Design an enzyme around this catalytic site. Sequence first.
Site, mmCIF file in Angstrom:
data_model
loop_
_atom_site.group_PDB
_atom_site.id
_atom_site.type_symbol
_atom_site.label_atom_id
_atom_site.label_comp_id
_atom_site.label_asym_id
_atom_site.label_seq_id
_atom_site.Cartn_x
_atom_site.Cartn_y
_atom_site.Cartn_z
ATOM 1 N N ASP A 1 -11.849 3.436 -0.119
ATOM 2 C CA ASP A 1 -10.867 2.867 -1.047
ATOM 3 C C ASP A 1 -11.385 1.609 -1.775
ATOM 4 O O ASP A 1 -10.642 0.653 -1.957
ATOM 5 C CB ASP A 1 -9.565 2.568 -0.273
ATOM 6 C CG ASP A 1 -8.288 2.393 -1.079
ATOM 7 O OD1 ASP A 1 -8.235 2.878 -2.234
ATOM 8 O OD2 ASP A 1 -7.334 1.800 -0.545
ATOM 9 N N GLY B 1 0.880 -1.161 0.000
ATOM 10 C CA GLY B 1 0.000 0.000 0.000
ATOM 11 C C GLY B 1 0.920 1.214 0.000
ATOM 12 O O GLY B 1 2.146 1.069 -0.207
HETATM 13 C C1 LIG Z 1 -3.093 -8.437 -3.167
HETATM 14 C C2 LIG Z 1 -2.052 -8.763 -2.133
HETATM 15 N N1 LIG Z 1 -2.637 -8.852 -0.780
HETATM 16 C C3 LIG Z 1 -2.859 -7.827 0.133
HETATM 17 C C4 LIG Z 1 -2.490 -6.432 -0.194
HETATM 18 O O1 LIG Z 1 -1.395 -6.225 -0.711
HETATM 19 N N2 LIG Z 1 -3.319 -5.425 0.169
HETATM 20 C C5 LIG Z 1 -2.761 -4.051 0.156
HETATM 21 C C6 LIG Z 1 -2.764 -3.260 1.419
HETATM 22 C C7 LIG Z 1 -1.478 -3.781 0.864
HETATM 23 C C8 LIG Z 1 -4.772 -5.561 0.474
HETATM 24 C C9 LIG Z 1 -5.676 -6.258 -0.482
HETATM 25 C C10 LIG Z 1 -5.743 -4.775 -0.336
HETATM 26 C C11 LIG Z 1 -3.454 -8.342 1.251
HETATM 27 C C12 LIG Z 1 -3.621 -9.736 1.042
HETATM 28 C C13 LIG Z 1 -4.141 -10.878 1.702
HETATM 29 C C14 LIG Z 1 -4.094 -12.129 1.092
HETATM 30 N N3 LIG Z 1 -4.723 -13.076 1.884
HETATM 31 C C15 LIG Z 1 -5.142 -12.391 2.921
HETATM 32 N N4 LIG Z 1 -4.818 -11.070 2.887
HETATM 33 C C16 LIG Z 1 -5.154 -10.077 3.904
HETATM 34 C C17 LIG Z 1 -3.495 -12.278 -0.185
HETATM 35 N N5 LIG Z 1 -3.250 -13.544 -0.704
HETATM 36 C C18 LIG Z 1 -2.561 -13.811 -1.853
HETATM 37 N N6 LIG Z 1 -2.341 -15.046 -2.214
HETATM 38 C C19 LIG Z 1 -1.506 -15.088 -3.312
HETATM 39 C C20 LIG Z 1 -1.183 -16.427 -3.891
HETATM 40 C C21 LIG Z 1 -1.094 -13.881 -3.794
HETATM 41 C C22 LIG Z 1 -0.114 -13.550 -4.887
HETATM 42 S S1 LIG Z 1 -1.787 -12.613 -2.835
HETATM 43 N N7 LIG Z 1 -3.038 -11.209 -0.850
HETATM 44 C C23 LIG Z 1 -3.105 -10.023 -0.230
#
Ligand SMILES: CCn1c(C(=O)N(C2CC2)C2CC2)cc2c3c(ncn3C)c(Nc3nc(C)c(C)s3)nc21
EC number: 2.7.10.2
Length: 289
Positions: A132, A17
């Site tokens: 957001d 972020g």
């Molecule tokens: C997209 C990456 N992202 C983020 C994340 O960056 N955000 C922003 C603030 C910074 C948030 C979604 C807005 C949070 C998160 C997450 C995941 N599982 C639980 N959470 C909370 C996940 N899982 C994923 N699995 C795999 C295989 C991925 C590649 S991404 N990817 C995540």
Amino acid sequence: TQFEERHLKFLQQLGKGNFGSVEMCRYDPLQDNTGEVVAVKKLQHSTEEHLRDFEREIEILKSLQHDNIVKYKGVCYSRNLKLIMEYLPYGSLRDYLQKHKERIDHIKLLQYTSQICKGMEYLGTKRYIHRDLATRNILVENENRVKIGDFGLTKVLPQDKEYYKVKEPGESPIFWYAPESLTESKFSVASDVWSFGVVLYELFTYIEKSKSPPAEFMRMIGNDKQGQMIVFHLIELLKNNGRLPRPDGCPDEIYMIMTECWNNNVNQRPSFRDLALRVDQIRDNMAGH
Ligand SMILES: CCn1c(C(=O)N(C2CC2)C2CC2)cc2c3c(ncn3C)c(Nc3nc(C)c(C)s3)nc21
């Protein structure tokens, strides 16, 4: 709810972020590789104002319990404060949609849309303003379930007002912003509805690079526009009913929902409950249900 830093094994960086980063970890206290995989949010750069904001965000997430909202697991104090959440294996809806374009149909997009509306209505009952809403901030638990996955910009409404004024320093997501958020920094349930229409647009474009809201707006405004000038030209465009075009293959009834969310008149935008009823009605027509 209290996680020990020593037992949190780093696996990979998931995303960033403006001020918070998210990583995949295994919380393995037994050190026998049987611990569960969790998502950990930390401050990319620790300051007191960022620390206070992050403590408010943690309190907001802890207070939310819904199928379409990412689960709070706990905190980690090292203060090098870390937010522990459940891990969602399909990542962001933005990335998911872009990989499975050819396998995700309109009725499946409407299933996702309906879940977003339900999660958003639940926020509204707590008088929380997300500020957001974008497909990059929605996470995929499985092929049938999406969740609002971050609350970094979420604000609690004052008791006596239906809007909250904020001007955060450093780069805002202006192409998802309602006009009154651009001109007056006013955030409300109705500006979330405006941003929701942009999410709906994103979904029906299947995240086509050329068809993104920044790309379509920059085209309409002119690619020759400065920086501070982009905001002012965007304000004028929206004031003169300049809108994102109907995405390729989008049914008129779906584009109509988008255009109604994009009303310049705050009070005339639909409610999240009405959005969910309309979306479910269209889904049912499409299924012959
Ligand atoms: C997209 C990456 N992202 C983020 C994340 O960056 N955000 C922003 C603030 C910074 C948030 C979604 C807005 C949070 C998160 C997450 C995941 N599982 C639980 N959470 C909370 C996940 N899982 C994923 N699995 C795999 C295989 C991925 C590649 S991404 N990817 C995540």
